[PDB]
Design a protein around this nucleic acid. Structure first.
Ligand SMILES: [Mg+2]
Ligand SMILES: [Mg+2]
Ligand SMILES: [Mg+2]
Ligand SMILES: [Mg+2]
Ligand SMILES: [Mg+2]
Lengths: 114, 178, 79
RNA sequence: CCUCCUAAAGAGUAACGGAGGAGCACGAAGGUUGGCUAAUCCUGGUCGGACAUCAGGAGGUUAGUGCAAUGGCAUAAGCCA
RNA sequence: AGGGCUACACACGUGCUACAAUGGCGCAUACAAAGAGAAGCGACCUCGCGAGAGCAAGCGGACCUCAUAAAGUGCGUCGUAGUCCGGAUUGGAGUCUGCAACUCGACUCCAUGAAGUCGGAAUCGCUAGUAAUCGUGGAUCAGAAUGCCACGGUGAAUACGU
C-alpha cells in the first residue's frame, strides 16, 4: 500500500518494511507498530487490510518525505543565506561538521579531479 | 453542468451587483478550459508522447491532439513536423464537469498546495496555471504510470479585464491564495 | 554548538551592547569575544567582529542569535 | 540555358561590364473537391530555457513558394485531407 | 586579545571500518588476564529514551570502584537483495568537560543512509599459542585515540628445497 505515499513495502516484516518510509527509521517503526497495535513479524503484504489503515493514521503524526525534505532544506538555506560557517561550508561543498579537507572528503565533496 | 448551473445561480448575480452589470448577457462566462501539456522530448523515447497523451486521454474524457512543431528553427531540435505535445481543450459539459473534476478533487489532491496563484491571469482576463506534476487524479490507474507527468491548464473567459477574471472562479470554489 | 543550559558571552560586549541598545544604534562594535552568543538585544546592531587581521561588519538578524559572532567571520583566507 | 541591372517608362541592344543560378526534382511535390492561413512581438502557463507545445492580445502578404533572380500569388500558386 | 598549527584541485606512507549468511539482528546465557584510583575510582538508590544528572556508601586497595569480557553457545529471524549488509554525510535537538566548544571538543536521541559486492601493476607481516580473529587495561590528560604501550580468549596453514 502507498501508506505515507507511493512506497509499497511488502513481503517483509512490518517493522523494517515500515522503515521504507523516507521519513521513519528503525526506532520509529519498532515503536509505531506497537502504538498502532501491530506486531513486527507480520508481513505487511499479507497483512489484514484494516490493520493497514491503522499504520497510515499513526504514521501521519511523524513528518515524512514531502514536508520532510521540504523543511530539511529550508533549515540549510537559512544558515546558508545567513553567512555563518555552516552555510559557507554548504555553498562551498565542504564538510560542515568540521572534518579534514587536506585528506578524506570524497563523501562531502566530489571524488577525484586530478 | 453541475457547476454550470451554479454559475447562472450564485454567480452571474453576484457579479451583476458586485460588478454592477446591466445585461445578464455580459457576466464573464467560463469559456472552455484548454489543457495542453507540452510533453516534448519524444526523440529520446517517442513513446512517452503517446503516454503523455493516454494520460491526458484519462485526465479528460476526450481524445488528445498530439500537436506537432512549427518553426523547426529549434536548438533543442524539431523539424517542422515532429510530435511535441497534446493540447486537448474542453467541451462544454465535459468542460464544466472538468472544472468540477479539479478544484474539488484535483487541486484538492495536492502535494503541498498551500494556496494558488492570484496572478496566473493575463491582460484580457484569463488564467493558466501549471500543475507542476500530474496528481495521479482519476487517471488510468494510479501507481501504474511512468516517470512523472505534469502539464498546463488555461481557463480563458470572456472577461474584458484580468480584474473581472478574479470575480469569476472566485464566485466558484477556486482555492487561490490569500 | 551545544553548551548545556545557559547562553554565554563576554562582559565586554554585554556592557557595550547593553548601553547601545538604550542609547540606540551607532558606530560598530570592536570586540574579539567572537566565542560569545548572539542575543536579540544585539539585533540590528553595528558589530565589528575581528578575525585575525581586523574586525568585520555584521547585522544581528532574527535567525542570527543562538550562534556565535565568530561563525560570521571567516578566519582563513582561501583563493 | 535561366534571372536582375546596364537598356534612355513598347520589343530589342554591346563590353575580358556589375551580381547570381541550370544539366535537375516530384506517381505526388500532378488532377479535382472540400477546408485552412501566416512571420514576428507582448502577456500569462509543469518540466520549457534565446529559441519547442498551450492561452489570449498586437501584428498584418515583414511568412510560405522543391532549388537562382525577377514578376506573381488570399478567388491564394501558400497549407491540410 | 583573537587567529593560525584542524587550511584545499591535488599526490604518497600508516592505519580504522565495510563490502556480509564462517553473517546481520532479537532474546537467553558460559568461561579471562592485566591494570588504574583522596582536585581520585566512585557503588546503591532516584530521575532521564540516552549521553548524563541528584543524593550519596565504600576504597587508598588479594577488602571498595572503574567493570557488564567479547567472541562463544541455545533458540529465533532475515534468504543473498546493494539487502534487516555497510555505515560516511548531513539535518534537527541535547549531555558533559572546562573562563571558554565559531573557527576546532568527545558523546547521546531521532532522522538521513553515500562510497563500497573483496580492490590493476605492484607490494607487506607472520614458522605456533605464531598468523588470523575477539575483546580488556594504562601512560598522556579538565576535556578530543581508529595512535602507542600492555593484557588475556579462541586458534590455523605451510616449509621440497636454495
Ligand atoms: Mg525595354
Ligand atoms: Mg512564454
Ligand atoms: Mg600538525
Ligand atoms: Mg584512568
Ligand atoms: Mg584518560
Amino acid at each position: 500500500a502507498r501508506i505515507a505515499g507511493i512506497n509499497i513495502p511488502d513481503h517483509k516484516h512490518a517493522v523494517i518494511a515500515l522503515t521504507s518510509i523516507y521519513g521513519v527509521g528503525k526506532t520509529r517503526s519498532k515503536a509505531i507498530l506497537a502504538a498502532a497495535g501491530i506486531a513486527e513479524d507480520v508481513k505487511i503484504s499479507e497483512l489484514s487490510e484494516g490493520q493497514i489503515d491503522t499504520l497510515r493514521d499513526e504514521v501521519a503524526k511523524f513528518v515524512v518525505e514531502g514536508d520532510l525534505r521540504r523543511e530539511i532544506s529550508m533549515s540549510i538555506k537559512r544558515l546558508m543565506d545567513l553567512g555563518c560557517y555552516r552555510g559557507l561550508r554548504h555553498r562551498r561543498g565542504l564538510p560542515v561538521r568540521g572534518q579534514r579537507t587536506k585528506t578524506n572528503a570524497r563523501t562531502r565533496k566530489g571524488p577525484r579531479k586530478p | 453542468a453541475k457547476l454550470h448551473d451554479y454559475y447562472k445561480d450564485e454567480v452571474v448575480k453576484k457579479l451583476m451587483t458586485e460588478f454592477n452589470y446591466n445585461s445578464v448577457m455580459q457576466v464573464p462566462r467560463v469559456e472552455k478550459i484548454t489543457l495542453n501539456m507540452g510533453v516534448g522530448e519524444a526523440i529520446a523515447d517517442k513513446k512517452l508522447l503517446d503516454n503523455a497523451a493516454a494520460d491526458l486521454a484519462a485526465i479528460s474524457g476526450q481524445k488528445p491532439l498530439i500537436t506537432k512543431a512549427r518553426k523547426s528553427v529549434a536548438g533543442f531540435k524539431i523539424r517542422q513536423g515532429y510530435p511535441i505535445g497534446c493540447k486537448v481543450t474542453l467541451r462544454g459539459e465535459r468542460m464544466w464537469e472538468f472544472f468540477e473534476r479539479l478544484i474539488t478533487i484535483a487541486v484538492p489532491r495536492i502535494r503541498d498546495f498551500r494556496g494558488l496563484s492570484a496572478k496566473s491571469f493575463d491582460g484580457r482576463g484569463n488564467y493558466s496555471m501549471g500543475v507542476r506534476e500530474q496528481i495521479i487524479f482519476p487517471e488510468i490507474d494510479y501507481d501504474k504510470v511512468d516517470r512523472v507527468r505534469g502539464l498546463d491548464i488555461t481557463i480563458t473567459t470572456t472577461a474584458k479585464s484580468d480584474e473581472e477574471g478574479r470575480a469569476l472562479l472566485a464566485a466558484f470554489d477556486f482555492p487561490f491564495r490569500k | 554548538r551545544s553548551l548545556k543550559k545557559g547562553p554565554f558571552i563576554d562582559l565586554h560586549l554585554l556592557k557595550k551592547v547593553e548601553k547601545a541598545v538604550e542609547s540606540g544604534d551607532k558606530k560598530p562594535l570592536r570586540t574579539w569575544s567572537r566565542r560569545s552568543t548572539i542575543f536579540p538585544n544585539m539585533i540590528g546592531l553595528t558589530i565589528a567582529v575581528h578575525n585575525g587581521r581586523q574586525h568585520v561588519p555584521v547585522f544581528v538578524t532574527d535567525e542570527m542569535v543562538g550562534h556565535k559572532l565568530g561563525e560570521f567571520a571567516p578566519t582563513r583566507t582561501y583563493r
